[PDB]
Ligand binder design. Structure first.
Ligand code: FAD
Ligand code: FAD
Lengths: 230, 230
């Protein structure tokens, strides 16, 4: 079930990173926001037709009592309907939103059931999701963050703070760069959350399973976008 | 004159080796970056007072058009105000920086005026400076690199690539270990750049002059730190 949402504000978090604030009073009814919770939007055709384009974006602000919420959107090159929308939308615009397909992230209750560390892999598009994860990881658990870099402005996108976060930025030469940048160490009992580009995710998953020995139950991997395709 | 710099990013190049990225548009108004160029930072008191502590760090990244730059910092043991800062600083923090007393490294333009080889001596603290040197040494000039080792993780600190680079690692038993490790060979017309610990440098200089026959003008020696002293 979709809901209509009205844009109320727009803030430039980084030069190519736009936070769009909306309101949808019935959206969060029985829908609890978790780390990496996301929404489907039906974005308008920039060229003016009635065709709409469904894209996914992570929730970065939420107030269930008012239905106010926000999403952070990368202004990527080349552009698409959603990033064009982020660039040009003004408060007062409306858009249909839906919550369906989103599984949350959670740290186990028992400390002795928790991973001995989190391996987070993504880029600018999954930084909202990864930031939500970092904000809930206990302070005594280390975090190895790998961010595939596409522009110099990427370093300006704010990251969540954590006392045991170690950040690694990866220059993308091809789809093999992200998997090759991963440190070869002991990954025993670690948990991996990966939301990178589709072509890079393929070679990342292969490395996690075969070389790093990650079990399936300790990996969540979803392609957040695809190079050269919608 | 100092300039205010804002921290924009932090990356863990090695487990005890942190690259801190900053921005300061006015810094590169009168500063030209050369190999081994360094800056003076006024680090804050980790204990929370108004006292500041001036320390030197090598420029590893620089963009004069935007004012963005980076330094690589060793997380040493025992810690000091600067390495504590490297461990604990978050993006958005500010710090005063100054360029004063920094002389660069250069290779003679005339090939017949160039050294027949480069003898590079240092450790993790002078590895950013040494890397900058390696990157500009012509491919037909051999490089003999000696790095005094303090921890096993020191081999994880990336070195610059060079077709004629030969690396030698030295375990430190005392201030005499580094000098004794140097190979006794013909060093005629070689050039030496040395930035090790102060006590080790004293005995290195003596061996360069008294035993290896290095002229004073073919040697650059600068102590980068002192054992048991701030
Ligand atoms: C669960 C989920 C959550 C997501 N959350 C976010 C979020 O919070 N913030 C965010 O910015 N993105 C997020 N994404 C990714 C976003 O949906 C994609 O980037 C999407 O393709 C952008 O839609 P678009 O209309 O702008 O471009 P599209 O029409 O899909 O593609 C047009 C062109 O732009 C390229 N392109 C698309 N995205 C990128 C990109 N990041 N970087 C470089 N090039 C790109 C494409 O390769 C293509 O060539 C999420 C994806 C998923 C699956
Ligand atoms: C021109 C110049 C450029 C330099 N560039 C760099 C650079 O790019 N990256 C870098 O990491 N360092 C660099 N150094 C060395 C750095 O300035 C010293 O390590 C400095 O002492 C660090 O300041 P601190 O506050 O962390 O420790 P301090 O307060 O000075 O000393 C605290 C304690 O830690 C010890 N200690 C200090 N440094 C080290 C060290 N490397 N290894 C082991 N023990 C140490 C000291 O002996 C002392 O006991 C440079 C020095 C010079 C002169």
């Amino acid at each position: 079930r979709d809901h209509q949402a009205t844009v109320v504000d727009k803030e430039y978090i980084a030069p190519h990173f736009v936070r769009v604030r909306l309101v949808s009073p019935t959206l969060f009814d029985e829908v609890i926001v978790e780390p990496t919770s996301w929404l489907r939007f039906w974005f308008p055709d920039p060229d003016g037709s009635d065709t709409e384009f469904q894209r996914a974006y992570t929730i970065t602000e939420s107030d269930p009592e008012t239905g106010r919420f926000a999403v952070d959107m990368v202004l990527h090159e080349p552009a698409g309907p959603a990033s064009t929308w982020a660039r040009t939308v003004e408060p007062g615009a409306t858009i249909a939103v839906m919550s369906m397909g989103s599984r949350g992230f959670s740290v186990p209750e028992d400390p002795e059931d928790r991973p001995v560390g989190y391996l987070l892999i993504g880029d600018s598009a999954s930084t909202p999701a990864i930031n939500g994860i970092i904000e809930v990881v206990p302070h005594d658990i280390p975090i190895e963050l790998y961010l595939e870099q596409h522009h110099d402005d990427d370093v300006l996108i704010p990251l969540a703070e954590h006392p045991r976060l170690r950040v690694h930025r990866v220059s993308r030469d091809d789809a093999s760069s992200l998997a090759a940048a991963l440190e070869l160490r002991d990954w025993s009992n670690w948990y991996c959350w990966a939301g990178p580009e589709a072509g890079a995710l393929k070679q990342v998953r292969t490395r996690l399973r075969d070389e790093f020995g990650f079990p399936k139950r300790e990996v969540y991997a979803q392609a957040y976008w695809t190079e050269g395709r919608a």
